[PDB]
Amino acid sequence: MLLQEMADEAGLDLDELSQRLARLRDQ
Amino acid sequence: SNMEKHLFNLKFAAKELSRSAKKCDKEEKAEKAKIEKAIQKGNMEVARIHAENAIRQKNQAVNFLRMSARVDAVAARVQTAVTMGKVTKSMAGVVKSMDATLKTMNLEKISALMDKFEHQFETLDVQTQQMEDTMSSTTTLTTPQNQVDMLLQEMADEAGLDLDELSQRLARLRDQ
């Protein structure tokens, strides 16, 4: 987040995941 | 830089050749006068040497003038080059500056910032309206509506241009 913010400033472009993995584990 | 001083030297040599041609011209005049004042005394050789000297002065003068014109043209060309080079350097500088600025202050950042400006001042309008409502509610006894209306009507009739029972009836309705 810090890098993205400071890139937007300097002007140049560059949890649910684990939950879904848990879903798969339960499956 | 070096080109500038070299240009200065070129123009110096140009005007030097010019003044040298003028010097040769005035020397030609002087020799022509000396031959006049010498031929009167019956000197043929002295006149001859004076004459050839004058012709040499004239020829060298025209040559110096031609050379001066050439060098002036060359120096003018070099001046053009120097000025164009300064312009090019300045344009490169502003190009670098604009590149840095645009990379820093891009179009997207501009748009976002301007939208933020707009929304901020809309919020400020809301604030002003809130304060308007409150200030109009507070200072209401000292600024009735009927009084100001009567004043406006009277002063309009003067300047010449056209523009309790209610609550009692509402009370009647409330009682009904």
From Swiss-Prot, chain A:
Consequence when changing L24A: Abolishes interaction with VPS4B
Region described as Interaction with VTA1: spans on this chain: 15-27
Annotated consequence of substituting L21A: Abolishes interaction with SPAST and VPS4A
Positions of the UniProt region annotated as Interaction with VPS4B: 15-27
Region (Interaction with VPS4A, MITD1 and STAMBP): 15-25
Subcellular location: Cytoplasm, Cytosol; Endosome; Late endosome membrane
Location of the motif MIT-interacting motif: 15-25
Tissue-level expression: Widely expressed. Expressed in pancreas, kidney, skeletal muscle, liver, lung, placenta and brain.
Protein's job: Probable peripherally associated component of the endosomal sorting required for transport complex III (ESCRT-III) which is involved in multivesicular bodies (MVBs) formation and sorting of endosomal cargo proteins into MVBs. MVBs contain intraluminal vesicles (ILVs) that are generated by invagination and scission from the limiting membrane of the endosome and mostly are delivered to lysosomes enabling degradation of membrane proteins, such as stimulated growth factor receptors, lysosomal enzymes and lipids.
Quaternary context: Probable peripherally associated component of the endosomal sorting required for transport complex III (ESCRT-III). ESCRT-III components are thought to multimerize to form a flat lattice on the perimeter membrane of the endosome. Several assembly forms of ESCRT-III may exist that interact and act sequentially. Interacts with CHMP1A. Interacts with VTA1; the interaction probably involves the open conformation of CHMP1B. Interacts with CHMP2A. Interacts with VPS4A; the interaction is direct. Interacts with VPS4B; the interaction is direct.
Family recorded in the similarity comment: Belongs to the SNF7 family.
Protein name listed in UniProt: Charged multivesicular body protein 1b
Organism placement in taxonomy: Eukaryota, Metazoa, Chordata, Craniata, Vertebrata
Residues of the full protein shown: 151 to 198 of 199
From Swiss-Prot, chain B:
GO molecular-function term, one example from the UniProt record: identical protein binding
Family: Belongs to the SNF7 family.
Region of interest (Interaction with VPS4B), residue spans: 164-176
Record's keyword terms, sorted: Cell cycle, Cell division, Coiled coil, Cytoplasm, Endosome, Membrane, Protein transport, Transport
Reported impact of L173A: Abolishes interaction with VPS4B
GO BP annotations listed: autophagosome maturation; autophagy; cell division; endosome transport via multivesicular body sorting pathway; ESCRT III complex disassembly; establishment of protein localization; late endosome to lysosome transport; late endosome to vacuole transport
Ranges for region Interaction with VTA1: 164-176
Keyword Zinc-finger: no
Disulfide bond annotation, renumbered to this chain: none
Membrane topology (UniProt): Peripheral membrane protein
Distribution of this protein across tissues and organs: Widely expressed. Expressed in pancreas, kidney, skeletal muscle, liver, lung, placenta and brain.
Organism: Homo sapiens (Human)
Coiled coil: 25-47
The gene coding this protein: CHMP1B
Protein name: Charged multivesicular body protein 1b
Record-level GO cellular component terms: amphisome membrane; autophagosome membrane; cytosol; endosome membrane; ESCRT III complex; extracellular exosome; kinetochore; kinetochore microtubule
